[PDB]
Amino acid sequence: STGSATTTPIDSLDDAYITPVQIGTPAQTLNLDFDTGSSDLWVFSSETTASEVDGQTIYTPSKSTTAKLLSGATWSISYGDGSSSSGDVYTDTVSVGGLTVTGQAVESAKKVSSSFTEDSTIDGLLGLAFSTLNTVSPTQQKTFFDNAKASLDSPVFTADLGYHAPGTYNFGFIDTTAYTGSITYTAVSTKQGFWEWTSTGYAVGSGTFKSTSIDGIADTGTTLLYLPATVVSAYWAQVSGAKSSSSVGGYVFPCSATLPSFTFGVGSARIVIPGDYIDFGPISTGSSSCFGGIQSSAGIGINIFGDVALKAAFVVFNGATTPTLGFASK
């Protein structure tokens, strides 16, 4: 089997991407944030505290003839941005782009933090990291990809995120029309539960490539590109007037600037992020200070190849017995 679904930016900045997901019988379609940095499929639901729902579409398990309470199971998750959610668990039929999993753990939110409430466009998350990170207790649950894997034509999914445009998540096949050149594959460590890999270096604009190992995670659920402070300083030093602002929370730059590109290495191959992809617009409405799309990871503990980086590539998440990542230009 295979699946193919379009993923759409939630706003004009590509702050996140939503993909429609069918849950239950008859189908209830919710728009989920596919997140290769986490491993829980959770939704706003009929159980979510009413004051914490503000425009989201909710899953109502009592209206699904295939929903079953997973008795005793609870979940609770905290994300790197400080947001969180928690609740109980049903199993139900879940379909993405024509690919159906029966018995998928659907984690129903009883509580969500304010940033989720405040984002009316995201009805939940669909985790695509390794199932060892799944938070369901006392019986850990498998991700959608893990449950689908054996049925897929090939044990892979691909992320093809658009810049200010829709893109595609495919399951079970590699669309050879969706990229240029060849796909370069690189090793993955699953020791932290992430799609963790080592970039071979970087360049700023037309500058020379610096060969240096940068360990980080391919994370579709993170908006920006978070890299070591040395690398980020070298980038922003090429933008007149750019500075790190403690009050804003990162590097800002004059909105009148033209940003240089940023290149990252995948083995001997190179992925070029155009400068425009690094512009996240005014820090507040009407400001001439703009927020940068490349930020320091120094306070995180891990480097994160988020959407800014991934949207410049066609990315293969290869879930073979020994997982690997593939990157191609497009």
Swiss-Prot record:
Residues at the active site: 35, 199
Domain of life assignment: Eukaryota
Top-level EC class: hydrolase
Keywords: Aspartyl protease, Disulfide bond, Hydrolase, Protease, Signal, Zymogen
Record bears the keyword Disulfide bond: yes
Reaction catalyzed: Hydrolysis of proteins with specificity similar to that of pepsin A, prefers hydrophobic residues at P1 and P1', but does not cleave 14-Ala-|-Leu-15 in the B chain of insulin or Z-Glu-Tyr. Clots milk
Disulphide linkage map: 255-290
EC number: 3.4.23.22
Listed GO biological process terms: proteolysis
Peptidase A1 domain ranges (all copies): 17-328
Any one GO molecular-function label of the UniProt entry: aspartic-type endopeptidase activity
TM spans (from-to): none
Entry keyword Hydrolase: yes
Family: Belongs to the peptidase A1 family.
Protein name from the UniProt record: Endothiapepsin
Organism: Cryphonectria parasitica (Chestnut blight fungus)
Residues included from the entire protein: 90 to 419 of 419
